[model samples]
Target chain A: MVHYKLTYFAIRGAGECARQIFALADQEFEDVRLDKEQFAKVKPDLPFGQVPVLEVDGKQLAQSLAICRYLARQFGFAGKSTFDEAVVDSLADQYSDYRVEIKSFFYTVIGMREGDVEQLKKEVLLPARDKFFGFITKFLKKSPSGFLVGDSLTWVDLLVSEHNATMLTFVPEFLEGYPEVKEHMEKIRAIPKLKKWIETRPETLF
Target chain B: VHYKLTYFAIRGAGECARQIFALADQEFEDVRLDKEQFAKVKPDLPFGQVPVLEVDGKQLAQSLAICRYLARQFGFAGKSTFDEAVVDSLADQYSDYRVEIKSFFYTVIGMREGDVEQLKKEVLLPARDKFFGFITKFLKKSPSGFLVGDSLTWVDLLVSEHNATMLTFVPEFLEGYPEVKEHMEKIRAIPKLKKWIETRPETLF
Candidate 1:
């Protein structure tokens, strides 16, 4: 049994996908959540001074997608072939680019930027959301299994599903107009292990 | 043997994959598009973006994804899955740094608006310093002088090419980061990359 320890904030912001991966795999690992003070003290020790670091056998790995992809590979959630893996990676990167498009709204919501939240949501957030949702819906429509990249659930599915759920907290109707995306999310949320984890996990405002 | 890479003539995001093909001595169709050409072909792309790789007529989007695919194909990704993850984490970190640098570079090139000197001083330099700080730490711990594992990966090519770009655009960019400077020079000096470096299209990225 390989030892695993994941350290992140208590919120499900960038860290929840990896947690959900662990749950889906039925793997037992240490989940270390830190507050602001705890994070500051350990900041110097982190590889990039950021959270969502997964330690495998005491070896630390930073970057949330990197960690998630690593776990997905180990747990057999990565794509089936080398090219399929690349496709999965491309989709993941595309989702990340979408995140970049709405940074202003995120900063405003997190109190890092001063703005009218509603205005930002309408102008910046929703436009970005629609464009991203449009892309994901197209991918899902093409997917034989209705997952993002392949005929089965991959790490990118966990990623977009968790993040889309987070978006709903603020927008409330985040998946409104994208029936394909909503259906895909429902498919992922309905996984037996994931459903159990979602029901039991601590809810956060993110 | 059918590999097609389509990107703008500039070396912004597409150069690393080009360098990878050059290193592997692989034959590829290097398709450089002008603004009008890109607009005409944009709709056909999977994600409506450039730097897409065509493997046997299959299109894959995203610059890093293209490079990583080529790397894995050419046995340059890593020795194992875990090592590949480390390589990926470093590459992703470098991507973030690139974003920070672009924020300033766009201003300098008149593509965006800002006080150039002020932005360089307050925004670009600090971000560069922090990026170099962590990068140098990684280099210091590496026994092979590569970013990850025991040999050169796509990240070395990626970072080295970007360093060349920065040196051209930002004067004295690597002045304070000696270890990083040495790593860049080492990567640039790889024997397989010499011809590509000498003969590749000249572009200010």
Candidate 2:
């Protein structure tokens, strides 16, 4: 049963990650992409009093990252062991910190009327981005098999793949510096079940 | 081993229930409360770094409630059905928030300089008194069995015990409010577990 509509400005806000997760897992959700008017009206009743709440049979599940994890559990790809589960959660959390920068950089560094773009470039963004690249390079090198963990596919791999692909929009050759990460994404993108799932989904115009 | 200091605060935080579980049956834990000097020196440490992190000398742990939960998991925690486990976690996390408020009241109320008393009287004290009142009401209605899902045993009791002790700053009759009056003092003076909680352990701020 469809619980309620998901309120958001566009696909770019937190919903994109969950939408992609469902696509990768070959699951269907009533993806409620909202416009300006609907967002204004429905957002007030959201569970966390925030947008992007996932409702399973009218029970609102708050937090976007938590929702993705819930869906991953539904798809049987979160983890096989407790250690594996912790690693998936930790890595996903790390990915969220990086993605926040990518999405919010313009508002924080550039969009400010008195923003110091140069100071931000030198101090905050560069070090964070460099640390992120280092993390990915090291993580991919240490993966025991095709994904971040063992041989079986997991949601962490799927999230990282979509995250890497999303970063491609920021710069034409952004991932060129991290070769192993690029290779890891390529492998994930080529996973037959996931690749086919993405192909058949309705084109999201949001 | 007990990987973090704040982890132990939770054990000391939940010690009564753990002691109850242990004395009623039998349990094991090697204490790992960090020194006060260590907490003062650690850069960017969590305010009031928690204590009583018991490393069973096996899995590494951080959250004190988490450590207690794992401890509860080891035994046949009479509250052992699937739904029973969920209640243990829910009340603990809720208590963690209220615990932070309790810590703020104790740790920072009058110690700071600017207009602190006004803030405590107007803000923190009123809020805390009401919350503890809610807990007292729940206890009266639920029967001494336990806090949530099962009447056997769980983290809810541990959390309520922590709140009760922290709220024990006054006498039994403050205003028309009945719940906030004496529940805290009554629980603490419960003469059962002195041997388990060794009152002689040096207190830390």
Candidate 3:
């Protein structure tokens, strides 16, 4: 078997999607979790001086989404066809945009940034969530298999599911209005392999 | 044979895919939209964003996703799947750099509020140095004179065009990174791409 090692912080921030992919595929790989000091010491050696780097047969690949997409393609979870793959990729990119919209609020909530938490929640976080949830709900309602992209589960589903769970910590009722999106999240969480992983994985604030 | 791309006239996020279509010698309907036109059609877009590619009747949004799909279709992705991942990683790294300097660029373009000069000095220059530093190191070690593979790939076109935009805004941007500069120039000078650049509408990015 090919050797695969994924290095990231213990948190399931960007690295969780790939981990869940591995779990779903029943692939065994090394999961290297780093602390702030460990990351800083090895930061210079990293490709882009960032975490969530995947090493395949000792060759390193940077970028969390790139790594996830690569692994998804390898593990038969990317998409059913080239066009489907592009659709999945487009949704992933949209998720990135949504992340950017709420990044400051998230950082403040996680204690990494300073801001009035209530004000940010009112102005930035809720507005961004509503826009994103609106579109995502529309897509989910139209999905035949109730997954994100194609009928079967794609990496994008894992991505959105994980992030939604993380968001729930801040606003437990955030998905109240978006029933389809909430159902989609539960559908992903209910997968047998994913449920096992979710039960055992290390818990982190994010 | 049916491809329709919709984006603003400027070479922002949309031009790389357009250049890819050009390099592949593929015929495509290049639909450039003004602000008013975009507003009218915004609701029809997948994610309410431009740089959308319509193949047949199906639409794909996201600039990089569209570019990557076209590159894959035209056999410019990479030699193998692993190489494609490498190319993707580099492309994403460049995106991170773009995000890093977005505030500065927006400030300069009067799209956002900030001290343009201070941002240029404090944000844009440092970002350029770090970005060029990584890119130059990769280029120096590259055996094929391209970013990822032996022959020209979509990333080369994307990076070269974006870096060219950087040159226009900051004339001395690539002064310290000769290898990257050369690579950018070399990609820009490719006969087909050269022709496209010469003929395409000129706009400030």
- The candidate maximizing DockQ is 1
lDDT of 3 by residue, B1-205 (tens): 6999999888889999999989999999999999999999998888888989999989999998998999999988998888899899888888888899999988776777998888888999999888887787789879879998788888998889887887877888887788988898889989999999999998888
Candidate 1 TM-score for chain A: 0.96
| Superposed Cα deviation of residue B190, candidate 2 (Å) | 12
Q: Chain B TM-score per candidate, please.
A: 0.97, 0.55, 0.97
How does model 3 score on DockQ?
Answer: 0.84
Q: How much RMSD separates candidate 1 from the native structure?
A: 1.2
Instruction: Name the lDDT value of residue B107 in candidate 3.
Output: 78
User: Which scores better on lDDT, 2 or 3?
Assistant: 3
Best by lDDT: 3
DockQ of each: 0.87, 0.10, 0.84
iRMS values in order, in angstroms?
0.8, 7.4, 0.7
Off by over 4 Å in 1: none
The residue-by-residue lDDT of candidate 2 on A1-206, one tens digit each, is 33333444555546666666666665556777677787778765653235676666655555565566666656677678644554565566566556555543545532434565556554665666677767666656767775776567777787777666755654346576778888888898897766775576444432
Runs of candidate 3 exceeding 4 Å displacement: none
C-alpha TM-scores of all predictions: 0.98, 0.57, 0.98
| Pairs clashing within candidate 1 | none
- What tens digits encode model 2's per-residue C-alpha lDDT throughout B1-205? 2222233433444354355444444444434444665565443331123332333422222233333344344442334323233343334334434543553455443334455456457655665565545445455655553444334343444554555444443323245544433443344344444444454243332
Candidate 2 structure, TM-score to reference: 0.57
